[PDB]
Amino acid sequence: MSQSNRELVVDFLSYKLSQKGYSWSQMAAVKQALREAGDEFELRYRRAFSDLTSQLHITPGTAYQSFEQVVNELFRDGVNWGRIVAFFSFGGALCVESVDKEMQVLVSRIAAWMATYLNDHLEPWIQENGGWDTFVELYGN
C-alpha cells in the first residue's frame, strides 16, 4: 500500500495540473491530450458509427483477427494523428463491447494488441513526426 497510496496522489495531482493547462510529466500530458481527442472524436462521430462495432461480432476466438483486420486496413496507406486517435477509440469500443457481452477476459488482451501495434508499427512514424509532443501541442487544450 506504500506504492498504491503514492499512485493515487500522483493520478489526482496529474488531473488537477491538467485542468489549468499544466502537466505532471510529459507522459501525463500525452495521456490527457489522448483522452480529450478520444472524447472529441466520439462526440463528433457517435451517430455515424451507429451499430458498426456490433457488426464485428466479437468472440475470444475471432477477436484477434478482427482487431488485426481493422487496424491493418486503417493504416494501409499511411499514418496521421487522426488515424491514431481513431485507433485508440476503436480499441476503446472493443473493450466496452467485450465487457457488455461478458467477455471481460478480452480487455487485457486487446490492451496487449494495442501496445504491441504501437511499439511495432506506429512508433517509427511517431518519432519522425516529432514524437508525441507534437501531438500534445496540436491536440491538447
Binding site: 486496413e73 486517435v85 485507433f87
Partner: peptide, 17 residues
C-alpha cells in the same frame, strides 16, 4: 465498413487539427 469509415473519421478529425 468499420475500418474505412475509422479512416475517413481519422482523416477529417487530420483535416480539422
Amino acid at each position: 465498413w468499420i475500418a474505412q469509415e475509422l479512416r475517413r473519421x481519422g482523416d477529417e478529425x487530420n483535416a480539422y487539427y
